[PDB]
């Protein structure tokens, strides 16, 4: 059945996965893909306590909650926040934050935008005496909310290779004499942070690893689908079609099956819109000829001639990876929080590159079944 595919999508869809993953397949000289990828078998004393406390966490969430807490005790200030450098499969970085004092919700900040954006992208701290005199600052929010931002201390969090993995930020030094952020404030703050980077890195490596295995589990489940019943294309291609629309979050899928007997044609065709069933034209063509996936961000901007806005189109090769059994077409990657259409990325290629392998084997065994099938109603 599908129903195996009911709460497939309750656990996941390919967008929890949109970060840099290890390559999902490795190819050799003569083009056997394998899945075996990456060969893989007092000041000081108060700081020691804090380190001891964070180091046990490989859950990024819990480790950020703890890092938030700590920074409160560390320099004295009105409002604190913590930012976490994220990154998707295209290697596009941004900042994220659910841990900010307002004094549920989730700030997202693009790479070089802002004070924090900037200290992020530059790996350099900002101690700002008076915000209203930094070009980089901007008082919209102060004014709207009636808060006034005097002093800022905004520090990069770095891992051991000294890459920025998030950012932390104190606003408005608590002070009698009316004071700015100290030099000792800067030092104490960076000292803590230099550890958070190393721990944060590790927690990120861990989760990436968990995510890489969750991927395998998805493929393994999808195999058990596909391979369930291999006695007719119309069935199987629907299963393939059905799943992919749901995991990949696209608007339509089309599978094209090369002619058994010529070698240049399209003996058959399937198509699903992203709700249900009606089954039974150029883009395939190119792929088949090229023997290579096709990602067009916008259709109307290429070397075809022109809704169908974003396209990814994948060759279904055969047992030996040689001929091209068939071809696979997805249109309009949506960002489906929204329904907003959107280009395909490496993540999307990787996953499909992978499912196509079983698709391959599924289809080419169905065909051999249907070829007996059809040597028997020639008795007809």
Identify which of residues 1 and 103 has a Cβ nearer to a second copy in the complex.
Answer: 1
Q: How far is the CB of 246 from a second copy (least distance, A)?
A: 13
Q: Degrees (nearest 5) of the Cα angle 224, 229, 231?
A: 150
Tracing tokens 């083009």 back to the chain, one arrives at: 31
Identify which of residues 91 and 224 has a Cβ nearer to a second copy in the complex.
Answer: 224
Tracing tokens 């964070």 back to the chain, one arrives at: 54
Identify which of residues 182 and 209 has a Cβ nearer to a second copy in the complex.
Answer: 209
Q: How far is the CB of 57 from a second copy (least distance, A)?
A: 9
Tracing tokens 């109603």 back to the chain, one arrives at: 377
Identify which of residues 198 and 313 has a Cβ nearer to a second copy in the complex.
Answer: 198
Q: How far is the CB of 202 from a second copy (least distance, A)?
A: 6
Q: What span, in angstroms and rounded, lies between the C-alpha atoms of 166 and 43?
A: 24
Q: How far is the CB of 368 from a second copy (least distance, A)?
A: 6
Q: How far is the CB of 47 from a second copy (least distance, A)?
A: 6
Identify which of residues 57 and 309 has a Cβ nearer to a second copy in the complex.
Answer: 57
Identify which of residues 285 and 365 has a Cβ nearer to a second copy in the complex.
Answer: 365
Structural contact between residues 26 and 34, judged by C-beta atoms closer than 8 angstroms: yes
Identify which of residues 186 and 212 has a Cβ nearer to a second copy in the complex.
Answer: 212
Q: How far is the CB of 295 from a second copy (least distance, A)?
A: 23
Pull the structure tokens for residue 41.
Answer: 């078998």
CB atoms within 10 A of CB 101: 15
Q: How far is the CB of 12 from a second copy (least distance, A)?
A: 7
Q: How far is the CB of 300 from a second copy (least distance, A)?
A: 36
Identify which of residues 139 and 368 has a Cβ nearer to a second copy in the complex.
Answer: 368
Q: How far is the CB of 214 from a second copy (least distance, A)?
A: 6
Identify which of residues 327 and 363 has a Cβ nearer to a second copy in the complex.
Answer: 363
């Amino acid at each position: 059945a599908m129903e195996h595919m009911a709460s497939m999508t309750r656990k996941i869809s390919a967008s929890e996965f949109d970060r840099p993953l290890r390559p999902i397949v490795v190819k050799d000289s003569e083009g056997t893909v394998s899945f075996l990828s990456d060969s893989e078998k007092d000041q000081s004393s108060r700081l020691l306590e804090l380190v001891k406390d964070i180091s046990s966490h490989l859950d990024v969430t819990a480790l950020c909650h703890k890092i938030f807490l700590h920074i409160h005790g560390l320099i004295s200030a009105d409002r604190y926040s913590l930012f976490l450098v994220c990154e998707d499969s295209s290697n596009d970085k941004f900042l994220i934050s659910r841990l900010f004092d307002v004094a549920n919700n989730c700030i997202r900040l693009e790479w070089n935008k802002g004070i924090v954006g900037h200290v992020a992208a530059l790996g350099e701290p900002l101690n700002i005496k008076d915000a209203y005199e930094d070009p980089r600052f901007n008082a919209e929010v102060d004014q709207i909310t009636g808060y006034k931002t005097q002093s800022i201390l905004c520090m990069p969090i770095k891992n051991h290779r000294e890459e920025v993995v998030g950012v932390a930020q104190a606003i408005n030094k608590k002070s009698g004499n009316g004071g700015t952020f100290t030099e000792k404030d800067e030092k104490d703050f960076a000292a803590y942070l230099a550890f958070c980077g190393i721990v944060l890195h590790n927690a990120q490596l861990y989760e990436t690893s968990l995510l890489e295995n969750k991927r395998n589990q998805v493929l393994l489940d999808l195999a058990s689908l596909i391979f369930e019943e291999q006695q007719s294309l119309e069935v199987i291609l629907k299963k393939i079609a059905a799943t992919i629309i749901s995991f990949m979050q696209v608007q339509k899928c089309t599978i094209f099956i090369v002619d058994e007997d010529c070698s240049d044609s399209f003996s058959s065709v399937f198509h699903m819109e992203c709700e249900e069933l009606e089954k039974s034209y150029m883009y395939a063509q190119y792929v088949k000829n090229t023997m290579e996936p096709l990602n067009i961000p916008d259709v109307s901007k290429d070397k075809r001639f022109p809704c169908i806005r974003s396209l990814l189109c994948t060759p279904i090769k055969n047992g030996k990876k040689n001929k091209v059994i068939g071809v696979c077409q997805l249109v309009n990657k949506m960002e489906e929080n929204t329904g907003k259409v959107k280009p395909f990325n490496r993540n999307d290629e990787q996953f499909l590159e992978a499912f196509v392998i079983f698709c391959g084997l599924g289809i080419q065994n169905t065909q051999m079944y249907e070829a007996v099938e059809r040597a028997m109603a020639k008795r007809n």
